[PDB]
Paper text:
DENV NS5 is a large protein of 900 amino acids composed of two domains with key enzymatic activities for viral RNA replication in the host cell and constitutes a prime target for the design of anti-viral inhibitors. A guanylyltransferase activity was also proposed for the N-terminal domain of NS5. Its C-terminal RdRp domain (residues 267–900) synthesizes the viral genomic RNA. DENV RdRp possesses a right hand-like architecture conserved across different polymerase families, with three subdomains termed ‘‘fingers”, ‘‘palm” and ‘‘thumb”. We performed a fragment-based screening by X-ray crystallography targeting the DENV NS5 polymerase and identified an allosteric binding pocket at the base of the thumb subdomain close to the enzyme active site.
Co-crystallization of compounds 27 and 29 with DENV3 FL NS5 led to the same binding mode as observed for the polymerase domain. Comprising 900 amino acid residues, NS5 is the largest and most conserved protein component of the flavivirus RC. Its N-terminal domain (residues 1–265 in DENV3) is an S-adenosyl-L-methionine (SAM)-dependent methyltransferase (MTase) that methylates the viral RNA genome cap. The sulfur of the thiophene ring makes a non-covalent interaction with the side-chain hydroxyl of S796, whilst the terminal propargyl alcohol arm extends deeply into a tunnel lined by residues W803, M761, and M765. Its terminal hydroxyl group forms H-bond interactions with the backbone amide of H800 and the side-chain of Q802, and displaced a single buried water molecule present in the RdRp apo structure. The terminal aromatic rings of 27 and 29 protrude from the enzyme and are solvent-exposed.
Author numbering: 6 to 405, 418 to 453, 470 to 743, 746 to 884
Write the structure that this text describes.
């Protein structure tokens, strides 16, 4: 009567240390603990999970196997991974963690992750000595392995007998250390009749343990579930070793949680029609899921869908063949780590989007209102807002997709746009929904068109060009940003600050939205009517579609939110640049002592002082900044700005990767300032002329070019050629990239015109999307059209196009000097031939220097 589990145990115990270390992780799932372990070593108390346990519990919670609610009790909490995870879930009101502690036992790790204020972890509490307490969720992860399965059987039954009296029509998730021993099976079968639930295997569990979890939400055959795991674990001994599937670890946020402040109160008069139409369109599967996870977004209903997305990105085989040394580079592989499945979407939504920003103080709201009014008057001094048109939108769609091109050519699409526009003119919206059938697609593209019609002027007419806005960089181009930062560096004063905001779009408040909409005051009446509908009905009352996995299949949830920026809405870039200019001017006023703590708290703050500063210094202060959406560089009049955090945090623009009240750190060397994911180097050309060039860690450049878009080798090769040409024009100064670009261009047929874009950045002008000789394009961009290049003498050779210094190239990720890189360089004509052979007997040219 020997079980398959007992057979697995005998085989496991016979493994040598070498084969046991390989087997334990073969084909498992594992979170990358690198960042958290280093953060915990540095004493950081925000974002990080204290152990692998938070991700372990997330696996069950995201599958609805256990849905913590009310008073949660965590038995054997150890460091607290399960408890800290629970603190941020919708229905959880209190988390009580109990753990033994003492020598050889894990102790609770104090943290300040989101909801720490409802987490009560107690050491010195051996749960086997504790009387059961009333709770709504019972969690238990206790069970120490033993080479003897009978010692494990005794430990398992001891846990099962300890936990059972805590169970009373509540949620639960209990580790069953050894579920294969017949006496454990018998006991679980009796427990399942009294308390329900089922046994599940968590794929984050190592193969060296047969642990399973008894979870409350589900049913099934315990014997079948146990034996299926035994078979899997047995097959894994002989299976060719598979490296573990790596997943991103959890981000548990920061700060106190006020459960009563989380719920969203929707404006049903405004959003009711949109919900009604989605319901009618998907009426056959429309349902109202009470188990939805949304804390701060209003939930309206769901319909059934097939799952969209992938765990990882597709790989460009042509670029991979010509970049062999980078196959072992972690940052290069980490680039291709993007989970867009309903699982990945829900994790991002919980961690980043499902938050609420406190309302700023009345004095802060007063300063923002004064500043916004002044800024809009400044921005509209020369230009007038204007309506964009069908003809203009059609032109943008055509010149940038295949379905969008078909749609804009369809008279039915524009008939639908007209019908919706007529509702907007009446102060009603019926079909404008965004995402986190052609009718669904026509309604979506139609929504984007109406937004473009009303607010497209901000981008189409370059309202944020440096000439129009002083701080802006819209239309400038990556090749000009470095020269702009060098120009800012000449302004006397403090260091150059470049603080990033954590999730800027989620930090856009109702006050920000009301300040942004003031641009309608400058519009013609018919335009004001259309923009007012966009701001009020759609930007300040967003209806969103988001996928969610469930035990029975995937669903599309319909949710809503009044504040935050609609990241998937047109106008985002311009409105973010506007609000960020305003926010940074307010921070400069605080740095200068114009705006004080007393002023921010004042409910009847006087405007005189603020207007005087804006009218006398405002433009000078805008010229000290480079602002692109949520990204900024600010060079204030002195360094008091580093310590000026009251208004910035009060406006909701909390800085990323730094404690709330820690002063910022700036740079005096403009070449080290980060901006738009780049930094910029000043180089001296062989002919003595200076050039300012853009740069980023080389692994990001290679990692990105190794990611395919959109069977078919031609499209893969052409996208490879597009990255190669972008490298020759923008990143020619990186040794590895100029060599790899020459290799790719030698490997791809000369007449094949680059297809598909390398980037969607607003800073990209795509001068590399051509068959024209790259040196004549280089001369055009860098010499002829370059306003910071006085001597217009062309360069006749790539030998006169400069590289970074060797040490600088290496600091920025070059592999120059490594043996693998020398081997790669030697192997280039061979790698080129390999790609050429895979493509076939086409016409190729040799670009190798
Ligand atoms: C913020 O990221 C970028 C910023 C850029 O410039 C500021 C660029 C550019 C590359 C080449 C450029 C040029 C030029 C001259 O016209 S501009 C490229 C990227 C870039 O990574 N583009 S991307 O691969 O499509 C990336 C994926 C994830 C973040 C996204 O944010 C825009 C875009
Ligand atoms: N008798 C007992 N009473 C309380 N805690 C106990 C115990 N026996 C073992 N433990 C604790 O139970 C824990 C199980 S592992 C805890 C991991 C946790 N779920 C997390 O996510 O961080 C260990 O830390 C161990 O010290
Ligand atoms: Mg920045
Ligand atoms: Zn609408
Ligand atoms: Zn660099």
């Amino acid at each position: 009567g020997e079980t398959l589990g007992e057979k697995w145990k005998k085989k496991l115990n016979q493994l040598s240390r070498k084969e046991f270390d390989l087997y334990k992780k073969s084909g498992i799932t594992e979170v990358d603990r690198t960042e958290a372990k280093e953060g915990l070593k540095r004493g950081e108390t925000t974002h990080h999970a204290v152990s692998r346990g938070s991700a372990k519990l997330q696996w069950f919670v995201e599958r609805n196997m256990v849905i913590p609610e009310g008073r949660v009790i965590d038995l054997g909490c150890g460091r607290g991974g399960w408890s800290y995870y629970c603190a941020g879930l919708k229905k959880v009101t209190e988390v009580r963690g109990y753990t033994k502690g003492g020598p050889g036992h894990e102790e609770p790790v104090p943290m300040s992750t989101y909801g720490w204020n409802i987490v009560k972890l107690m050491s010195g509490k051996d749960v086997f000595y504790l009387p059961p307490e009333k709770c709504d969720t019972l969690l238990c992860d206790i069970g120490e392995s033993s080479p003897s399965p009978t010692v494990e059987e005794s430990r398992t039954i001891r846990v099962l007998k300890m936990v059972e009296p805590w169970l009373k029509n509540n949620q639960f998730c209990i580790k069953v250390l050894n579920p294969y021993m017949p006496t454990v099976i018998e006991h679980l079968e009796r427990l399942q009749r009294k308390h329900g639930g089922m046994l599940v295997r968590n794929p984050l569990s190592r193969n060296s343990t047969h642990e399973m979890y008894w979870i409350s939400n589900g049913t099934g055959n315990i014997v079948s579930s146990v034996n299926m795991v035994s078979r899997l674990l047995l097959n894994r001994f002989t299976m060719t070793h598979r490296r573990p599937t790596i997943e991103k670890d959890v981000d548990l946020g920061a700060g106190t949680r006020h459960v009563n402040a989380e719920p969203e109160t929707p404006n049903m008069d405004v959003i009711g029609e949109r919900i009604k139409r989605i319901k009618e369109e998907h009426n056959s599967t429309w349902h109202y899921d009470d188990e939805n996870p949304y804390k701060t977004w209003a939930y309206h209903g769901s319909y059934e869908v097939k799952a969209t997305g992938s765990a990882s990105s597709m790989i460009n085989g042509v670029v991979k063949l010509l970049t062999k040394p980078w196959d072992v580079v972690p940052m290069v592989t980490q680039m291709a780590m993007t989970d867009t499945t309903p699982f990945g979407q829900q994790r991002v939504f919980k961690e980043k989007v499902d938050t609420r920003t406190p309302r700023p103080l009345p004095g802060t709201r007063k300063v923002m209102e004064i500043t916004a009014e002044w800024l809009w008057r400044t921005l509209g001094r020369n230009k007038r807002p204007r309506l964009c048109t069908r003809e203009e939108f059609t032109k943008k769609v055509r010149t940038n997709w295949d379905s969008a091109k078909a749609a804009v050519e369809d008279e039915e699409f524009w008939k639908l746009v007209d019908r919706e526009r007529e509702l907007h003119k009446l102060g009603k919206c019926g079909s404008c929904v965004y995402n986190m059938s052609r009718a669904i697609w026509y309604m979506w593209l139609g929504v984007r068109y109406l937004e473009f019609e009303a607010l497209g002027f901000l981008n189409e007419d370059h309202w944020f060009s440096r000439e129009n806005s002083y701080s802006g960089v819209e239309g400038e181009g990556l090749h000009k940003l470095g020269y702009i930062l060098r120009d800012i560096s000449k302004i006397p004063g403090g260091a150059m600050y470049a603080d990033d905001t954590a999730g800027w779009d989620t930090r856009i408040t109702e006050d920000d939205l009301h300040n942004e909409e003031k641009i309608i005051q400058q519009m013609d009446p018919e335009h004001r009517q259309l923009a007012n509908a966009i701001f009020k009905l759609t930007y300040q009352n967003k209806v969103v579609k988001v996928q969610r996995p469930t035990p029975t299949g995937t669903v599309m949830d319909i949710i809503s939110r009044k504040d935050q920026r609609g990241s998937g809405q047109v106008g985002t870039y311009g409105l973010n640049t506007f609000t960020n200019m305003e926010a940074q001017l307010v921070r400069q006023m605080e740095g200068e002592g114009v705006l004080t703590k007393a002023d921010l708290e004042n409910p009847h703050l006087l405007e005189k002082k603020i207007t005087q500063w804006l009218e006398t210094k405002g433009v000078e202060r805008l010229k000290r900044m480079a602002i692109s959406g949520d990204d900024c560089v600010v060079k204030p009049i002195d360094d008091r700005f580093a310590n000026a955090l009251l208004a910035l945090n009060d406006m909701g623009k909390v800085r990323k990767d730094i404690p709330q009240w820690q002063p910022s750190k700036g740079w005096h060397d403009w070449q080290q300032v980060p901006f738009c994911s780049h930094h910029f180097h000043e180089l001296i050309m062989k002919d003595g002329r200076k050039l300012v060039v853009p740069c980023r860690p080389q692994d990001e450049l290679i990692g990105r070019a190794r990611i395919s878009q959109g069977w078919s080798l031609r499209e893969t090769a052409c996208l490879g050629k597009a990255y190669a040409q972008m490298w020759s024009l923008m990143y020619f100064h990186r040794r590895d990239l100029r060599l790899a670009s020459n290799a790719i261009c030698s490997a791809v047929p000369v007449h094949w015109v680059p297809t598909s874009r390398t980037t969607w950045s607003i800073h990209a002008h795509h001068q590399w999307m051509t068959t024209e000789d790259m040196l004549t394009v280089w001369n055009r961009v860098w010499i002829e059209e370059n306003p910071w290049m006085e001597d217009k003498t062309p360069v006749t050779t790539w030998e006169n196009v400069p590289y970074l210094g060797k040490r600088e190239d290496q600091w920025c990720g070059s592999l120059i000097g490594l043996t693998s890189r020398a081997t790669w360089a030697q192997n280039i004509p061979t790698a080129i031939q390999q790609v050429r052979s895979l493509i076939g007997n086409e016409e190729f040219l040799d670009y190798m220097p």
